[model samples]
Target: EVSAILVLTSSEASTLERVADLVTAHALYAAHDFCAQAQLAAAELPSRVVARLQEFAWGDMNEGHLLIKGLPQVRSLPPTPTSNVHAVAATTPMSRYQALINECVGRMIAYEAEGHGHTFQDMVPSAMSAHSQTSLGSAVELELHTEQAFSPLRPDFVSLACLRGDPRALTYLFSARQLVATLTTQEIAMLREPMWTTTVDESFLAEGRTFLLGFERGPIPILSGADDDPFIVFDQDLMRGISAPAQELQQTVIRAYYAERVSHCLAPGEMLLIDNRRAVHGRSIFAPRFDGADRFLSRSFIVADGSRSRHARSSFGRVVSARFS
Candidate 1:
């Protein structure tokens, strides 16, 4: 119930379109120039919407995610790609709107190892990975985990814009605050201690790239910072505890998630911005027909401070190198 949902009025939605159109007319969506244009266009967003985004970015709310609905949608969309390729191209209304909204939060970034370093990734179900624990997997549930939990420079936010809908594909979100409520002081203390380790996601190693932390990383804590409002880093599939007690605590956290997780089936024209540090998320298994009408979504990563990753980025660009991640 702590999560916020904002449904725009018709006029407000149209205002978003008008602002997006300003950038769409002049710049290409995949280029760096488009990001600059979108940032400028973001200033003209509805004042009410801007206020909500600013408050969210400032971490004033305990909710770990925000759902924005009723945004403008394109009249037609291409068939969903069965592989790791973008289904939509150039500056469409949805992509432009997503850019404008993303700029409101922070600088949008991409990992060189993920989505092939594209600014916006096509989140379509891939047949090859349908049974794996990944975003492209639709046959098996995506186990709850923080995005890029193995990386030191993980994203501060994960933005998803739905271009197509799958009624049964429910996206689940469990916040650190919610998980903490189910924990005892002893368990919280145990979790805060450095007793965990995780392997880099196999997807990140597809090109035979190596990382600074090698394959397995940690002695890391699952929870950090203030007791009332803490940050979390966890992976159900790739992470493990270093000791027996630590392993038992890992299971406890997963059980808590099962009891308290919130779920939503994202629909077209809706956007979900998750505070990645404050929450772990997953998705339920849904049947993908592999037809052209299957579900499709666009995803982008945002970091509060881009300069922090300057060492990992070439020429201080948006994409971070795989080794540093």
Candidate 2:
């Protein structure tokens, strides 16, 4: 199969210099800096980059994941931030550019309001005692699941930009399109039935918040969207089924996903954009040293068209708040 990664040529990467300059000229201090007008003013990408991203944003024929190997260069970067608390404070000359490039694809959205509210999030390892099925920790596999599977307002896309990449870490992606190819009609029908439910992920809960939001919202289907091309909502670690066959179907899908997955270790200056509707994503097993040199990625969520969640927010710009079904 053809690799989904798009390597930018030297000339093309150079072309991005103007785009980056355009973005930085406005002085974007935080995620909200690139608001509706700001993003439109700064969204001038080179023709080549623009064409590829426009297609990717609209469910490009490529696999559900898109990777840009060579991104615009940043002048100076500090040592990797050790914790999310400090990491938020570590936004240097590079992160603003990352946010700008991501906005070229879609509006940056955030589910968390307690912190930066609707800004870039640091995907770094936290304290060892805090490790429990979150991207904030390493040393264990971050299992494959749709981001916010339990929320009707789940982000439509997830974007990650690498700053410090670990050689041992690999991010895994399984496209629903490719996944459907391996299943029979009977299996497809089983997945479409409203038999499964998912729990709210622990990561979504705010600090000192003991409970999960939408802990078990369902009788929802594992698959939705058009018959020719379907979208998926799956959380093997959190989803439960009502019937015996429905439960069995869950494991069957898991086995098939593992057998057909793809792995890639993100290099510095590369960004991975995942089409949340068409794929499930996760990280492989790896060890994190908790030092400033460990793996660090800047993360942002996007909703292709923010209008769908307009009522969810009063001003609604882009960052979606937690709204339960």
Candidate 3:
């Protein structure tokens, strides 16, 4: 079992607050300016913390995710929003803390189709979307899938910072390393073949938006790269096999996920970062009272190489255009 938990000491947590305060004072309102300040402030993070984040950015560990505990939080927390239109403001102490941590890993980027292309997305349970398979949904289980499984420019890392937590809402993670351990050589070979096809998420297609790949994508492999450390592209909601054998393999993968996936309930002052290419993540269904208090998490996307999506951004901006997403 690999150690994926990093618990910051009280002193370290206070140090982080000081750094976040600097960012808040300098660039509190604008996303671009905040990101610039965050990059500068990242240098002030504890060396041990920075080292761990940099190491995680380079490649996926066996665990495929990291839980960083004891970060700072906002003193005056607001009620969890009930709709996307009423999302929490992005300039809070916790959001700044998240940006500082994200900059340590990679350049934070946003997709125009998601969260209105904001650098920080407010993850709250929406009454209308509670039954859907989205971050805003809470009534139904969020099936395991890679973030933006249909996109060529999907994030390298997906981070979530908890402002409030639900005891029943468990975040699930299934790693490629864990999946490979359960499969036979023959099955592995078959999975590596181009046998999977998937459609873009309906949420991404909202507002009559269109993608370059249109609706369906691939004839692509479920696993790629080294056998020991493979990359997984999966979507339980939209992906399907092209053949009978391929379909069977898909079921086997799902079974393996149920058997070996890791689950954690995020706590306030804690953040979880998932390597998007190395693991699939989902969330358990939880009851939301629609009260002022509910599970609230802040999410951000990071790309190891910002230049990879340069063409998709106007004026080298942080938000990638929807067509290229």
Candidate 4:
């Protein structure tokens, strides 16, 4: 019954405060001519985006992915921050383009200089607005899984903003704390065996290869509390050699998902932040609509400036030359 909930309270005020509005404004200004100047910025354009975001936090958490909810100004924003942040519906083509550009920038800032960031952009399913439900899937549940396991450079943060949701409260979340609790003594032992092998799901076709989810050096620990802290990025589907007891424990956790859970409606302006380093997260199945207007959510990635190489003036994309450790 224990669910992992990491709610980091900042300012006890607003996350996207007036300052956030200003930063978002900057994004819009750049996006206004994004179509015109993006190509011109060429290789440096992505760096340009990260440079703007640096005006905010230190590239988000770069820690384990966890879920973050609530936004300060959801009512006023429709076109969203990057794409038109709505918590209850799908992201429009207009909004999609804006998110696309910001992502390139976030990626550039998080990885460009280190030659290690992996950029990924995608959408979430929510309630249908004027669009078709085919695209929304009515209401669907996705199993818990890490974003990318093939590459050693895993993302620190994976974020999503809700646009819409089912009229009935049907969605759910299963955290690692709760999942691990369901396992019996033997079950818990099996789950923690570190002997598990990981591989990319066939559907993703990552880098045109179905490679094993091996670590950079030796075997990587599954639930290690280092690096990303309470957050852990993982994909059950990627586990290659799991035992029956371990699988049973996983199912127990999944079943418990139906119990009291903390899930916010995909309202037009709310966002959910998930820490991808310590805890594992997933949801119940619903539906998917092919309509352009089906349930939708906006997602983006942020790196906490790679702790190993970060200092006060590390800056994004570059180390200021002076701190070129």
Candidate 5:
């Protein structure tokens, strides 16, 4: 079927330049000088950004992620991008940009990004080789699931800013719209009954719900918040029902990839904003060099306005006890 996947163009990237401009004074004040300078220009962010999100109709799904291109500056740490000025990897304006994005989004709230709980696994483990996915690391084929839905403590907004690419990464994006757009009357009828249930993918041990999504194991809510509402429950495989015929249809839906969507590597300085409450996301596997040279990306999460915060007892508002084993 047809899908409307919009690819946003690259920004002029005055970021690296702005950083350079401020430090020209001491010849080495660092990204902070630039950060200070950049903050001045940031006054316009709220204006231009809202223009884009509104134009795109960005937040209707349970999730939304957009990859922007250009940024040839951000790269593996110990970056050469900082020839004269000191650019601390942790304090770079780029790091600040993520927070700035939240400010521009109106309701978005940012949290200090926490490192992966385990070396072998990351935010999404079942899909990673760390948890024993026999496929290639960069293959990118993955099921559609909440960014961290399994976590009793989940992020409302998940952001990924890529510093490197996977020209070889055979990944795809699993979207709810894709399923609705392609499913037939019969297929749709079969999928709507919540016939399946899901448990945590081993990859989520350190970040989501320790318990299973459903116990009986037949017909789960594959999609939530339909028709301007949010959608949920997506897995490339394992979303099967007990019925033989329904199981067969499950395979067909996977093959059809009702809403499977993927794109080329997200470039540096470019971020993908996903609404965890509305959409499930996935990717094919791809190899990771692990030498700090392979496809690299940084991740963080956001939430809507403090209208619903439970931050008093958690690190990042996550329900700690339930999320950790």
Candidate 6:
């Protein structure tokens, strides 16, 4: 808990003040225009917050995740919207909070799969019985996975800002540094080999894009990079193994999941930032009533180094869509 949690105080005064200047500095929540200005505006944030964000981004002790509480306080809020909406209204205090926090670390980016490529995505259960494949699903357990495991252009950080809370819904996290220690030499070796196949997630598939599944996507490893500490690409629901050994290793990884899992049930006004490369996150099944009062979490994606996707961003500096090609 101490490793990845931070509660803001007066120390963040300048950071919030900088956000205040930027919030009114541009047309708020205006998509491409807002994203363009916000990226430049984030440059003026206070040194204190920037230092802390750099620590969470690079510190070995904290791993790649941090939960921040008591942020740009929500002076007012509308009832949490139900249904599969992705856009945030311009004038809300919470929307400004999400935008500012995203900038503190890196440039916010979006995918064509969700919200038609909006910067701050509305993450709430859709108006239906169940569909675990998407964050909008309610009844089925949202299986353990990285934000976008199939694509190489996935965000470096996955961020969430909670507007409403559900006592039953808990966000679970398990890190590679922690879980891989439990594996044997042979298992770790197999993980580094090209033995897995990943499917494009339902989010991308639902948008009518076709991918060359096994050949182009994978027959890849569950783990890669350094010997002791490695980067991970995983999705229990979206990834599958092509070989018997690979399949067996998949189950072994799953068994390690519960033993290593940690939970965070966010309260109102808490924002969770997770390193997409260092860990995989999941959520337990929670019942949703489809009322306006249902749980609502605002989500944003960030790349620590924005220049890497300069070509994919056709316009508005935020959306990275052409990678689907």
Worst 10 residues of 1 by lDDT: 24-33
For model 5, give the RMSD to the true fold: 7.6
**What tens-digit string does per-residue lDDT give for candidate 4 at 1-325?**
2232323244311422422322221222233233223223323323433343343224233322233333333343233121223222222332333233334334312222121221212254434421222112334445555555433455554555555443442334444555444545665454455644565333333353322332322233344342222233345555544556445554554465445345544444444444444344555445444444434455544445444435412433222121121
lDDT tens digits by residue: candidate 2, 1-325? 3277778887777666555555443222444555453366445656777777778888846578888888766456566676665554224545555655666677776654423443667787767623567777676788888987888777778888888788888899998887789989998988999999777775566654433344567789998888777899998889998899889989988998789888989878888989899999888777888766778887777777777767655473445555432
For candidate 1, report its TM-score. Answer: 0.96
lDDT of each: 0.86, 0.72, 0.86, 0.38, 0.45, 0.73
Q: How many backbone clashes does candidate 5 have?
A: 45
- Using TM-score as the yardstick, the better of models 2 and 4 is 2
RMSD of 2: 2.9
**Tens digit of lDDT per residue, candidate 1, span 1-325?**
3358878889989999889876743222345667777889899999999888888888754599989999997567888788766535333568888889999988888888998787778898989999998889999899999999998899999999998889999999999999999999999999999999988998888566778879998889999988889999999888889999999999999999999999999999999999999999999989999888888888888889989899999773678988898
Q: Name the regions of candidate 3 deviating beyond 4 angstroms.
A: 1-3, 25-29, 60-62
Sequence-dependent TM-score of model 6:
0.89
lDDT of model number 1: 0.86
Candidate 1 vs candidate 6: which has greater TM-score? 1
The whole-model C-alpha lDDT of candidate 3 against the native structure comes to 0.86
The local lDDT score (0 to 100) that residue 121 gets in candidate 1 is 84
Distance from true location, Cα of 148 in model 5, Å: 3.1
Candidate with better TM-score, 1 vs 4: 1
TM-score of each: 0.96, 0.89, 0.96, 0.52, 0.65, 0.89
Residue 108, model 1: lDDT of: 82
Q: List, residue by residue over 45-72, the lDDT tens digit for candidate 5.
A: 4354445544433465423555443333
In candidate 5, residue 306 scores what lDDT?
41
